[PDB]
């Protein structure tokens, strides 16, 4: 995993291009992907 640098990511089959950063967002145990106003995925939970 690479943080804070522009990368080409695949998380649980979700693919894209982003800058992976840490976050304080708190997902309920059953939630996996967060989404934005534009529905483009804002926040994911590192699976491992």
């Amino acid at each position: 995993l690479v943080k804070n640098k522009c990368v080409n990511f695949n998380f649980n089959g979700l693919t894209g291009t982003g800058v992976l950063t840490e976050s304080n967002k708190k997902f309920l145990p059953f939630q996996q992907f967060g989404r934005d106003i534009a529905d483009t995925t804002d926040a994911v939970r590192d699976p491992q």
Binding site: I37, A38, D39, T40
Partner: protein, 48 residues
């Protein structure tokens, strides 16, 4: 002249209150801004 001085200088005096105490004063301009921020915001939701 003196009578007009008092009437003029007092007239400018009233503008301050009518501006500061009433939010609808600029309602033309505040709408011109609230149209773009409304049109762009909607243009982002279209991504959903």
């Amino acid at each position: 002249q003196k009578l007009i001085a008092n009437q003029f200088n007092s007239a400018i005096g009233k503008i301050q209150d009518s501006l500061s105490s009433t939010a609808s004063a600029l309602g033309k301009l505040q709408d011109v801004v609230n149209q773009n921020a409304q049109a762009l915001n909607t243009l982002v939701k279209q991504l959903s």
